[PDB]
């Protein structure tokens, strides 16, 4: 009943063109084959360096709600079916990663074939993942390399960091000696990562590893000699072009408070790489910043074309 076309006429508004979105945010013709009950492997959004066994708890359009086997439902989270952060059963073994066992297990007694029988569940077929385990690694980024990275919750802190994982075309950025929670997955064009020695050439302060002795005198050359690690090569950094979203353009975005919902949205403000989302009909107190390449923002029509409910403006 509610329609974008009429809303646009009603508001004299324009939608953010599909061309401003990454292909993965815009694609609507892919089928979602995940079914309730299927089991798979995936990273913990709150500990992106760790892999757990997850179960499909809900399917809605091109999205799915995953549940941490043996854990409380509080931990449940939503992803798109084309998410690069989930993998078919057996992935951790083929790629050399470690798999945390269900709450109640120990790795020494985990095996898919048998956890599957014990649960009488089926594993999500591997073609079902837009990805798999073929993708060539990101050029010039290898586990162990070091670089400088922005701490996304401490946007003005550019810290000493390291590449701790590499999956397909992305890598995991870790802040030396800090909590694994601040870690995040990147690709070579991320605007949050810089070549070793960037802060110095910019006159910006650089935050050294936690408890690093005599912090005031942290010296990169000393640090990598100490660690015997290599700096990610300068040529590997291919930072991306600023997005072209303009204020007032409309789109669809997942609700941050109730992730199961997606609402009509507008671009309230912009930066080179981020856009401030405003949910039509709600208080601006809910407005939030989000990277332009975030998987949870989509062009008008995405919910309709994928079979997902769309929450119209608040009234």
Swiss-Prot record:
<feature type="repeat" description="MBT 1">
    <location>
        <begin position="2"/>
        <end position="102"/>
    </location>
</feature>
<feature type="region of interest" description="Interaction with monomethylated and dimethylated peptides">
    <location>
        <begin position="175"/>
        <end position="182"/>
    </location>
</feature>
<feature type="repeat" description="MBT 2">
    <location>
        <begin position="110"/>
        <end position="209"/>
    </location>
</feature>
<comment type="subunit">
    <text>Homodimer. Interacts with RB1/RB (when monomethylated at 'Lys-860'). Interacts with p53/TP53 (when monomethylated at 'Lys-382'). Interacts with CBX3, ETV6, KMT5A and VCP/p97.</text>
</comment>
<feature type="site" description="Mediates recognition of monomethylated and dimethylated peptides">
    <location>
        <position position="151"/>
    </location>
</feature>
<feature type="site" description="Positioned at the entrance of MBT 2 and is required for recognition of monomethylated and dimethylated peptides">
    <location>
        <position position="154"/>
    </location>
</feature>
<protein>
    <recommendedName>
        <fullName>Lethal(3)malignant brain tumor-like protein 1</fullName>
    </recommendedName>
</protein>
<comment type="function">
    <text>Polycomb group (PcG) protein that specifically recognizes and binds mono- and dimethyllysine residues on target proteins, thereby acting as a 'reader' of a network of post-translational modifications. PcG proteins maintain the transcriptionally repressive state of genes: acts as a chromatin compaction factor by recognizing and binding mono- and dimethylated histone H1b/H1-4 at 'Lys-26' (H1bK26me1 and H1bK26me2) and histone H4 at 'Lys-20' (H4K20me1 and H4K20me2), leading to condense chromatin and repress transcription.</text>
</comment>
<feature type="repeat" description="MBT 3">
    <location>
        <begin position="218"/>
        <end position="313"/>
    </location>
</feature>
